Design a protein around this ligand. Structure first.
Ligand code: BCL
Ligand code: BCL
Ligand SMILES: CC[C@H]1c2cc3[nH]c4c(c3C)C(=O)[C@H](C(=O)OC)c4c3nc(cc4[nH]c(cc(n2)[C@@H]1C)c(C(C)=O)c4C)[C@@H](C)[C@@H]3CCC(=O)OC/C=C(\C)CCC[C@H](C)CCC[C@H](C)CCCC(C)C
Ligand SMILES: COC1=C(OC)C(=O)C(C/C=C(\C)CC/C=C(\C)CC/C=C(\C)CC/C=C(\C)CC/C=C(\C)CC/C=C(\C)CC/C=C(\C)CC/C=C(\C)CC/C=C(\C)CCC=C(C)C)=C(C)C1=O
Ligand SMILES: COC1=C(OC)C(=O)C(C/C=C(\C)CC/C=C(\C)CC/C=C(\C)CC/C=C(\C)CC/C=C(\C)CC/C=C(\C)CC/C=C(\C)CC/C=C(\C)CC/C=C(\C)CCC=C(C)C)=C(C)C1=O
Ligand SMILES: CCCCCCCCCCCCCCCCCC(=O)OC[C@H](COP(=O)(O)OCCN)OC(=O)CCCCCCCCCCCCCCCCC
Ligand SMILES: CCCCCCCCCCCCCCCCCC(=O)OC[C@H](COP(=O)(O)OCCN)OC(=O)CCCCCCCCCCCCCCCCC
Ligand SMILES: COC(C)(C)C/C=C/C(C)=C/C=C/C(C)=C/C=C/C(C)=C/C=C/C=C(C)/C=C/C=C(/C)CC/C=C(/C)CCC=C(C)C
Ligand SMILES: COC(C)(C)C/C=C/C(C)=C/C=C/C(C)=C/C=C/C(C)=C/C=C/C=C(C)/C=C\C=C(\C)CC/C=C(\C)CCC=C(C)C
Ligand SMILES: COC(C)(C)C/C=C/C(C)=C/C=C/C(C)=C/C=C/C(C)=C/C=C/C=C(C)\C=C/C=C(/C)CC/C=C(/C)CCC=C(C)C
Ligand SMILES: COC(C)(C)C/C=C/C(C)=C/C=C/C(C)=C/C=C/C(C)=C/C=C\C=C(C)/C=C\C=C(\C)CC/C=C(\C)CCC=C(C)C
Ligand SMILES: COC(C)(C)C/C=C/C(C)=C/C=C/C(C)=C\C=C\C(C)=C\C=C\C=C(C)\C=C\C=C(\C)CC/C=C(/C)CCC=C(C)C
Ligand SMILES: [Fe+3]
Lengths: 305, 275, 53, 250, 81, 44, 53, 44, 44, 44, 53, 53, 44, 53
């Protein structure tokens, strides 16, 4: 039986340039390419993109942050292109040391460049957030994507903005290296007792696992009912066919309750969004409220002794 | 109590083992042959968990833990209070998980639809079986399985992680984390896009699937498409499961030092070895 | 009184199944609570009383 | 706020976690009730209202506006299914299968069940018919993979029922959705691409017998297809996966 | 014959049918069970050929003295260590 | 004479009477068991 | 009494399936509980009784 | 005449009679087993 | 006595297959319960 | 009559007698096995 | 007074189910609270009172 | 004075369920507040008052 | 006559009177409880 | 004055529910702030004032 995992025969007509629903067309590029290796899995069209004020500004600020991280790597390699490549994952642009507190007076190669890059990184993610909002607004769509992105941004900002301010030191923000930010994560768990005994870290993991499991379930369900017009999820929300019914009856017979075509996406939205929302809460409480989650768990009756 | 469209789908057929012997529903739940076996396995495992809890000193459901046998029993069957209850529950868990998948197969056969759901759940089952069977068999002791408890199995995760230094430096672990993070991001974006199209700005007609192609093409330049997003989410989650299982399988069987030292192949490449 | 009119409200099949499940779980929990307490664990008490039964 | 606790060991952390549990119970209530907009109220096995309806009450009615002058849709609708189903119960109790009273595939029951959708074509964002033969699209062309047109089509018993003569594509999402089969029976037939495997020599359909191909639900027109016709065709093949499985080899 | 037996033979056809069916059920169960046991035994055998440091990992579970059901209150699997 | 379950008033009465006999038998067995347990190992 | 009217409420096929499941599960549980107690584990009791059986 | 299962009153009576014979046989065997076990190793 | 009437409710073919499955599973429970006890394992 | 399986009364009696023959054969072989094990390694 | 008109507003089935569940859960919570407190745990109280019952 | 007309805008069912849930949760939290304070924990206070009750 | 809820004006009147009676009963019981608690252990 | 026209712009159901929630949360946080500060924790203050009440 055909498993709808890969397309068998690809087809292509005139390239699709998008819906016009209040988008400024002069900010939308005009060139599309049609790349058939992608058409085995999904769409083949590498479509146009929209480039307006917010996107341009976000790209400029983010690219400058990226550039500044790179330049710091070059300088700490003592200019060597060999060390630069050998340490592309092991090097990091680190925040100022604890003695500088939250002041903006730390040497340029000991946190100052970290501060400047961090400022421009902050600017670009917020501008990208505004972009996600405004692209929905220009098409007349709801704002669910921007809200979901706000949750992930909330974890990001508690990581490097909110919590270091509440702790009184930039030195607790995460550095900009591939391996050093993993080292940062490990150190963070090690200094706050053990982050497994942080209930919001537990809840964040539950929502991460659940969102992975949920989208295994949902992708498998839609693929299983693809024989019927299944993946046309919109228009099954407003005109229920057998794909939606059989999808509902599978899960009802299996676990005793089911979702609807529209409502499974609310479950997934909330499970995905709750992972960084709950995670940010648990990091924010670490150090500020609880210093040692292990003894806190012992006091609150979920760690023995 | 049937859904208002359910009746026309409640027909005989689709079973694998026992014909019409178990081909009936109990409330919402289809039973079938593997519903009988999954109920029995689940009940016996739960009930042995409760019995093992009774032999301890706490009834707190966050402190109850059933522990695997000590290493000195190797791969033998342990005395029932010295790890044997763990083995009974583990065998019951495998029985129930496998029965659950086979029951899912029968439901798919009755509602003639693809078998993707039991396949994906089998990937989850494989991760579990790697954790409690495959890895401890290669290491030669059931006691390398993880203790059963809401917060004590996290002690297992901690101890095994810190056996190999910082477990972050495990390339398969890195790959698995990226797949978990990415599938969560993809679920967020897919749910958001569907909800945005179905729930427009106030007073506007419902959006089309063209509008959502247009939304991602405007935002990132690419749209995978309606069929593509489900294929993508399915394979992302399945790969996360599989590469996590490979991550843990490699640790203690073929790799034994701190995982950080694995990257010494790159850091000790002879041209920049000494720099 | 005239509690029979509960059967005008609830279906007997659902109520009997629910009652059976409830009673089974309650009886199991009470016995397990007794057995976990070494003041009402009858197996060990009989071991003590009969000098290892 | 370290070590400073409300209530004697109840913290800002304790407060946060209890607050989350309260919010999450409310969100579960909201999510469950949102997911009850189809299929309620629950019925009994004779088409009448069920005695039990569950702990969750139904949500308030919500309306969808449909583009291209296709009215409004309010859910939950409280309406019962708008088709008759030729089944008959096999037991006086509940929880047992209902048996087909005639041909399950022709009647449209079980895995061959179709839902009564509207007898109009699904539309793309510009108001045109969404799924059309390539003779109509006329700017579509095969881009990769092997073209099935002209190949013989082989049923789930190894007998050839005809040849692929046309593809029906989705003009919005650039995809082939149906294969039009010219039958030696004497007529034509649409086969869902999700139910066909294209190979070098033939397209093999392992869900439908050769005798079943003589009676595939037809379309009114050969330039567009309604959602009702789509449901009937796809349901016919998916039901064949049960009601034709004995015709397979061995 | 709209019954899997009609004439039945009442003692021999029925007996052969029942032996065939029960033997089929038992035989498939035996095949599955022995395949699983063989897979586990093969994994143990293979693990015997892994490097010796595959047997150096310490016991990865924490015994909390409130879950210790061995018989003695010590926080460990007694009679070993 | 309407009801949620569709049972008539008479049907509910006989149903309830049989159910009450069953409940009373269960309760009387439980009572005898509790007297035995209390004589053996009093908990109050 | 006239408890036979349970069969006007509960169908015998499902009742017999559920009854068999429950009864076998209860028997297995009780035997397992007895095996875990070192006063009612008959294998070890016989081991002691005969000097290693 | 209340009947959910579809039986008549007679078929229910016959079914219950056979069921009770089965139950009594099972319980008799269990009683014998418990008496033997109590003699072998008493638990009260 | 009248226990033969069980075959009026449960089809004997399916019961035979299911009973084969059940009997083998019961056997494996008992054998490896025995293997769990040191004094009754026969491998060594 | 009460026939879920479609058998007649007479077919059920004959199949029950065959089933009983098979079950007593199985039990007798099991008894021989238990006597052998008990002689070898008695558990009571 | 005339509280009965609540049954004109709230469906009896849901209300009775919720009341039963809530009352059982509340009774369980209170009993567990008393057992958790070593001044009202009646099992250990009886153990002390009768000198190892 | 004329606060009744609110029932013309707010559906009584949702209002009553919300009030019941809120009142129960508030009462539960006040009691737990008092129990967690060792000046208002009536169980331990009575234990002290009656010399181990 | 705006009725978000479908109640008539007099239905709202009776509903409000009943609700107020219940509220006053609850509050009076709470007042008595607070006086008893204040005598037993004063908290201001 | 003439503020009633706000009720022509803001739906009273949403505004009233939101305002109730906000007022309740504000009151709860103010009380918790007072309890957390050991100068306005009235339970402990009364314990000290009456010599353990
Ligand atoms: C020794 C290591 C510690 C540990 C320490 C930590 C710490 C420290 C943290 C976590 C956090 C998380 N941990 Mg951990 N954790 C451990 C063990 C585990 C285990 C396990 C099996 O053992 C698991 C499954 C997890 C799981 C998780 C996640 C649930 C959670 C992050 C959620 C999230 O949304 O992330 C993914 C989302 C983000 C990182 C958000 C930011 C991403 C932003 C939005 C990106 C924007 C664009 C970007 C700027 C630019 C580039 C784009 C251009 C295109 C190039 N932890 C142990 C105990 N864990 C976090 C948390 O929430 O804790 C409560 C956290 O901070
Ligand atoms: C000190 C701790 C170490 C560490 C040590 C380990 C170890 C050790 C392991 C992992 C594993 C994983 N870690 Mg790590 N990990 C750390 C930090 C992290 C961080 C982080 C941000 O810091 C993250 C995101 C992760 C992420 C991950 C995942 C890639 C992976 C867990 C998923 C998995 O296995 O699913 C697999 C899913 C399952 C096994 C679930 C199976 C479910 C079954 C089939 C069904 C059960 C049903 C149930 C009983 C039913 C109840 C009934 C009710 C009705 C519902 N780790 C640190 C550095 N990590 C684990 C792994 O890869 O495992 C394979 C693993 O073993
Ligand atoms: C619900 C929570 C999950 C989530 C949600 C989420 N993320 C989102 C969204 C949502 C809903 C978006 O709408 C948004 C988006 O647009 O996605 C497509 C986004 C997104 N989440 C992203 C990443 C991301 N999300 C993550 C996590 C998650 N996001 C959560 C699991 C992670 C993890 C796990 O760490 C990452 C890394 C992005 C793809 C995107 C946000 C886009 C963004 O932030 O843009 C800001 C831009 C920059 C920093 C510019 C970088 C520029 C390049 C470096 C230029 C290169 C130039 C050249 C190579 C040379 C350069 C150097 C010099 C010479 C210039
Ligand atoms: C488009 O499609 C989609 C839907 O549908 C339209 C959906 O529904 C869903 C399904 C997903 C949801 C409804 C969202 C919520 C689901 C989750 C968050 C997943 C987590 C769910 C749980 C917490 C699992 C709990 C349920 C279980 C395991 C049921 C437990 C039941 C038993 C153990 C016993 C079963 C009873 C039996 C077998 C009776 C046997 C009888 C005898 C006598 C024997 C998906 C994925 C979907 O994409
Ligand atoms: C510490 O040592 C030990 C171990 O560890 C080394 C062990 O692992 C174990 C053994 C392990 C377990 C107990 C768990 C794993 C067990 C298995 C692998 C076997 C699985 C058993 C089943 C799935 C059987 C379940 C059977 C059921 C539910 C009964 C079915 C009954 C019905 C359906 C109703 C009646 C039937 C009908 C409808 C027809 C009527 C019948 C006629 C004959 C007529 C033990 C005991 C042990 O102690
Ligand atoms: C266990 C002892 C009781 C079982 C013995 C008898 C079982 C007979 C088979 C059976 O279950 O019948 C199906 C039952 C009744 O449904 P029937 O579908 O009624 O027709 C509907 C008419 N309205 O179908 C059902 O409706 C079953 C559900 C009835 C209501 C159950 C209420 C909740 C169940 C318990 C709460 C959940 C806890 C489950 C276990 C938790 C374990 C931790
Ligand atoms: C022995 C102990 C047993 C329990 C301990 C196990 C741990 C439990 C933790 C998760 C809870 C899982 C239990 C799920 C119950 C499965 C049974 C079930 O849900 O079906 C019954 C019920 C009836 O369905 P229906 O009639 O259709 O409802 C609508 C009609 N009014 O269907 C419904 O109720 C519909 C409502 C769906 C319920 C939503 C499920 C929420 C799951 C989200 C959890 C994710 C976060 C978990 C955090 C974990 C932290 C450790
Ligand atoms: C805690 O762990 C342990 C497991 C320690 C203790 C567990 C104890 C428990 C719960 C044990 C459970 C035991 C049970 C429920 C056993 C049930 C056994 C049964 C019902 C056995 C029935 C066997 C029936 C058979 C084999 C029927 C065969 C019929 C046939 C027709 C076969 C055809 C072949 C022949 C030769 C038929 C004869 C015909 C002629 C003409 C001679
Ligand atoms: C100290 O720890 C504490 C924590 C233990 C834990 C819990 C404490 C608590 C809260 C305990 C609460 C226990 C409760 C609520 C117990 C209630 C028990 C009940 C309601 C038992 C009722 C049993 C009823 C029975 C057995 C009824 C009937 C049986 C029959 C055989 C009747 C048959 C019915 C028939 C035949 C109807 C057919 C009639 C017709 C006309 C067809
Ligand atoms: C050839 O040219 C170049 C030089 C391209 C070679 C380039 C090499 C490059 C670009 C190397 C870059 C490497 C890496 C490793 C980039 C990624 C680093 C990682 C792991 C970043 C993860 C960061 C996580 C967080 C939470 C980051 C930021 C969070 C914020 C809330 C930002 C805002 C924080 C602050 C303190 C803003 C400061 C504001 C003021 C006013 C001081
Ligand atoms: C926790 O400790 C600290 C002190 C931290 C913080 C304190 C915080 C605050 C703000 C506490 C106070 C909160 C509030 C807003 C309390 C107000 C409660 C109110 C206004 C209750 C109103 C009415 C009460 C009742 C009981 C209403 C109706 C009568 C009943 C019998 C309830 C059930 C009936 C309903 C719902 C309507 C149908 C009528 C009848 C008679 C059945
Ligand atoms: C530590 O203590 C623990 C924790 C164990 C907790 C205790 C839990 C317990 C013991 C819970 C409760 C157990 C209970 C409440 C009940 C057990 C009841 C039993 C043993 C019922 C057994 C019945 C056996 C039967 C009915 C055998 C039947 C055999 C037959 C051949 C009957 C044939 C029947 C019919 C109807 C033939 C068909 C006839 C026609 C006319 C179609
Ligand atoms: Fe979807």
């Amino acid at each position: 039986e055909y498993q709808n995992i890969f397309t068998q025969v690809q087809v292509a007509g005139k390239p699709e340039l998008g819906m016009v629903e209040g988008v400024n067309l002069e900010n939308r590029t005009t060139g599309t390419t049609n790349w058939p290796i992608l058409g085995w899995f999904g769409n083949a069209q590498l479509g146009p993109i929209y480039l307006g004020t917010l996107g341009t500004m976000s790209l400029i600020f983010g690219a400058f942050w990226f550039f500044l991280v790179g330049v710091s790597f070059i300088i700490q390699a003592d200019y060597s292109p060999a060390l630069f490549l050998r340490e592309l994952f092991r090097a990091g642009l680190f925040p100022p040391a604890p003695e500088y507190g939250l002041s903006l007076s730390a040497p340029l190669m000991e946190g100052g460049l970290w501060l400047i890059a961090s400022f421009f990184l902050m600017l670009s993610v917020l501008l990208w957030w505004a972009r996600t909002y405004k692209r929905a607004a220009d098409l007349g769509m709801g704002k669910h994507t921007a809200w979901a992105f706000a949750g992930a941004l909330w974890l990001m900002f508690v990581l490097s903005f909110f919590r270091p301010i509440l702790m009184g030191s930039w030195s607790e923000a995460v550095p900009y290296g591939i391996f050093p930010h993993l080292d940062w994560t490990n150190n963070f768990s090690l200094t706050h007792g053990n982050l497994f005994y942080n209930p919001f870290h537990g809840l964040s993991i539950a929502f991460l696992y659940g969102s992975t499991m949920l989208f295994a379930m949902h992708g498998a369900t839609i693929l299983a009912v693809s024989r019927l017009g299944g993946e046309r999820e919109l228009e099954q929300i407003v005109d229920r066919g057998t794909a939606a019914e059989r999808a509902a009856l599978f899960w009802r017979w299996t676990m005793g309750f089911n979702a609807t075509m529209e409502g499974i996406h609310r479950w997934g939205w909330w499970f995905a969004v709750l992972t960084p929302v709950t995670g940010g809460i648990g990091i924010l409480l670490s150090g500020t409220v609880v210093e040692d989650w292990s003894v806190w768990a012992q006091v609150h009756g979920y760690k023995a002794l | 109590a049937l859904l208002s469209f359910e009746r026309k789908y409640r027909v005989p057929g689709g079973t694998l083992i026992g014909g019409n012997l178990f081909d009936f529903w109990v409330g919402p739940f289809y039973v079938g042959f593997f519903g009988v076996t999954s109920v029995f396995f689940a009940a016996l495992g739960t009930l042995m968990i409760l019995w093992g809890a009774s032999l301890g000193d706490t009834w707190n459901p966050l402190l109850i833990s059933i522990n695997p046998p000590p290493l000195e029993y190797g791969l033998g069957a342990a005395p029932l209070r010295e790890g044997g209850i763990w083995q009974v529950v583990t065998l019951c868990a495998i029985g129930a998980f496998v029965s659950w998948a086979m029951r899912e197969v029968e439901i798919c056969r009755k509602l003639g639809i693809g078998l993707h759901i039991p396949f994906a759940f089998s990937f989850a089952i494989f991760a579990y079986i790697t954790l409690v069977v495959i890895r401890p068999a290669l290491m030669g002791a059931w006691g390398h399985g993880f203790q059963y408890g809401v917060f004590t199995h996290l002690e297992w995760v901690n101890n095994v992680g810190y056996q190999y230094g910082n477990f972050h430096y495990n390339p398969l672990h890195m790959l698995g984390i990226s797949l978990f993070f990415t599938t969560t991001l993809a679920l967020g974006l897919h749910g958001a896009l569907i909800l945005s199209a179905a729930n427009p700005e106030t007073g506007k007609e419902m959006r089309t699937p063209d509008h959502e192609d247009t939304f991602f093409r405007d935002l990132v330049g690419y749209s995978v498409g309606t069929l593509g997003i489900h294929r993508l989410g399915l394979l992302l989650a399945l790969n996360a499961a599989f590469w996590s299982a490979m991550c843990i399988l490699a640790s203690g069987t073929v790799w034994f030092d701190q995982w950080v030292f694995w990257w010494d192949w790159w850091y000790n490449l002879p041209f920049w070895a000494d720099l | 009184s005239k509690f029979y009119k509960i059967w005008l409200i609830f279906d007997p099949r659902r109520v009997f199944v629910a009652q059976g499940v409830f009673l089974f779980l309650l009886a199991v929990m009470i016995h397990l609570m007794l057995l976990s307490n070494p003041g009402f664990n009858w197996l060990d008490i009989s071991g003590v009383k009969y000098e290892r039964v | 706020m370290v070590g400073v606790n409300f209530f004697g060991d109840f913290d800002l952390a304790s407060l946060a976690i209890w607050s989350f549990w309260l919010f999450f119970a409310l969100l579960v209530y909201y999510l469950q009730t949102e997911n009850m907009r189809e299929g309620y109220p629950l019925e009994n096995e004779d088409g009448g209202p069920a005695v039990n309806q569950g702990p969750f009450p139904l949500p308030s009615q919500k309306t969808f506006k449909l583009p291209h002058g296709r009215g409004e849709v309010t859910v939950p609708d409280y309406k019962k299914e708008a088709r008759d189903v030729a089944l008959a119960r096999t037991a006086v109790n509940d929880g047992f299968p209902h048996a087909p009273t005639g041909n399950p595939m022709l009647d449209g029951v079980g895995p061959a069940s179709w839902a009564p959708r509207r007898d109009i074509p699904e539309l793309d964002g510009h108001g045109h018919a969404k799924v059309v033969p390539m003779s109509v699209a006329s700017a579509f062309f095969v881009s990769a993979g092997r073209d099935p047109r002209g190949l013989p089509v082989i049923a789930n018993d190894m007998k050839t029922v005809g040849t692929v003569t046309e593809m029906w594509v989705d003009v919005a999402e650039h995809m082939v959705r149906y294969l039009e089969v010219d039958l030696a029976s004497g007529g034509k037939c649409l086969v869902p691409m999700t139910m066909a495997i294209i190979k070098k020599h033939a397209v093999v359909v392992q869900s439908i017998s050769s005798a079943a191909f003589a009676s595939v639900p037809q379309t009114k027109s050969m330039t567009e297809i309604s959602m009702l016709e789509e449901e009937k065709i796809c349901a016919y093949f998916a039901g064949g996966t049960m009601y034709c499985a004995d015709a397979k080899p061995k | 014959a709209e019954k899997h037996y009609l004439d039945g033979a009442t003692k021999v056809g029925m007996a052969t049918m029942g032996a065939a069916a029960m033997g089929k059920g038992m035989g498939i169960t035996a095949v599955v069970f022995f395949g699983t046991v063989f897979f586990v035994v093969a994994l143990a055998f293979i693990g015997q050929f892994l490097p010796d440091r595959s047997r150096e990992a310490p016991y990865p579970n924490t015994i909390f003295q409130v879950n210790d059901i061995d018989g003695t209150v010590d926080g460990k699997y007694t009679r070993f260590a | 004479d309407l009801s949620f379950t569709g049972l008539t008033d008479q049907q509910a009465q006989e149903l309830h009477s049989v159910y009450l006999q069953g409940m009373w038998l269960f309760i009387s067995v439980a009572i005898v068991a509790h007297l035995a347990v209390f004589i053996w190992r009093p908990w109050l």
